[PDB]
Amino acid sequence: QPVLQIQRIYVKDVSFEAPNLPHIFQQEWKPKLGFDLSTETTQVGDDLYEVVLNISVETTLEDSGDVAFICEVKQAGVFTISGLEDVQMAHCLTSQCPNMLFPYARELVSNLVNRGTFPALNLSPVNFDALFVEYMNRQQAEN
Amino acid sequence: QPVLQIQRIYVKDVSFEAPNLPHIFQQEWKPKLGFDLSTETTQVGDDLYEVVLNISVETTLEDSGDVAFICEVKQAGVFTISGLEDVQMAHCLTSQCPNMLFPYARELVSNLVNRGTFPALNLSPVNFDALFVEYMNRQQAENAEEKSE
Amino acid sequence: QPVLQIQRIYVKDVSFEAPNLPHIFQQEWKPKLGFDLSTETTQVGDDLYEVVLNISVETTLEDSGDVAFICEVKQAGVFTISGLEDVQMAHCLTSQCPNMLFPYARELVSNLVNRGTFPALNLSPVNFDALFVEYMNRQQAE
Amino acid sequence: VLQIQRIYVKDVSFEAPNLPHIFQQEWKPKLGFDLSTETTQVGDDLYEVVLNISVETTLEDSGDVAFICEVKQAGVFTISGLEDVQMAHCLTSQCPNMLFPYARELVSNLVNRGTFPALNLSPVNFDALFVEYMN
């Protein structure tokens, strides 16, 4: 029988620069979000995996092209996973686990950004399943 | 009369790093705390000053000496200050204001280390008039050097 | 192509009470935690619902029975939901959303228990799909 | 002798009973401040100073409440050796002012969770209040 369980959820790395600060608040609010996302998976112990969801957000206010902020995040989870065939295992490490972390990472980004008094940045969903399919293509590609 | 009013408390830079997860979680919680603190100031308007409070902490474990986490914060706020003798002004800026900012950067610190799922880290109350004092204590030598140019 | 988008994560209500302070800090920390959680939906706009996640936590200390803290949080959202079959939709409403809201409500609880200077309280993952299934075992009960 | 031993919240509330049917309007705020202080001896030269703050923002013209925040920020202070009245000043002006900035980011923090516009409470003349006390 297969097993997928979370052992711990924790941040491995956080960041939130907002340079041209004191002033930028004068300019008018017209964003240019520069999302990006990734996931790495390190095996730790027998049947234990660290799935890390890497995320970079970067509002940019069009005309000026001057950064409004750059939030980066590494939300991780250690999981116990066993009894899965190669492809399933890959859906776990690539969509299942990342998908469960995602919402914690969303809250983080939302919390930081909020600390810079900026306007709410509640990250929109990601389709991890697609990401899985894409993951599979990339692997056959390389092979 | 004299005027002090908060315009906007806000963050300008925050980072947090916990380089030894998860393996470190298995070690005995023997915390060693590094904690440097500092303040800066900048006028950005007519009676508009933006004070910055920097904080850096770093925990290591007694036994292995490994690093548990590093967190750096730059809490800032912009204020409207006016009608003060140069001496008052300096207190306001090196103490009064940074003081106002302290809880904000404190919470952020507690917040982040808790996301590392490490034991609480609630910075102890800081004496801000102290910094003012160090500020004064530095003048004489600084003015001397300033004069030497 | 369906539609799921977030319009506003926000708190409708939150309460934190620590009634036996500072005396309680003299007791040994032997916690017995009570946890309760529920959900509510409400169409507000046209393809716009305010999903609410209610969480209530209480902790007493075992030797004295005294209350260390009680905390209640109403974390809400307002989302744009469209183009979903009756099943997918009620799932989205009763599970998928409340889930997105979980981290927000969680952080709030840990944040407040920490201002009371009590040991950390980081709510463990909640299984909303399970609560979703029971939601159905209640409707069908009719 | 005067030193802070522990800083903590005894009670906190924050209700915004008109969401999300207001995020659509603009700001026409009418803050409703109120503030108390209570001290209690809890031990040998140990006093619990409690700073009570209420802030009921009512959006004027509409009349409805935008939110009601009620914080009890407190602290346990070791305090000894003070002439009768000069003590009062400690327990009613000195200590509270020490707690206020914590009571401030708390109120900010909540308000910011209600998505409303940043509410960074304004400075309170704690000595001036002390006067209207002895009366």
From Swiss-Prot, chain C:
GO molecular function, one term: unfolded protein binding
Gene Ontology CC, one term: cytoplasm
UniProt KW Protein transport keyword: yes
Record keywords, A-Z: Chaperone, Cytoplasm, Protein transport, Translocation, Transport
Any single GO BP term: protein transport
Keyword Chaperone: yes
Domain of life, per lineage: Bacteria
Compartments where found: Cytoplasm
Family: Belongs to the SecB family.
Oligomer status and interactors: Homotetramer, a dimer of dimers. One homotetramer interacts with 1 SecA dimer.
Function: One of the proteins required for the normal export of preproteins out of the cell cytoplasm. It is a molecular chaperone that binds to a subset of precursor proteins, maintaining them in a translocation-competent state. It also specifically binds to its receptor SecA.
The protein's name: Protein-export protein SecB
Source organism of this protein record: Haemophilus influenzae (strain ATCC 51907 / DSM 11121 / KW20 / Rd)
Entire protein: shown range: 15 to 156 of 169
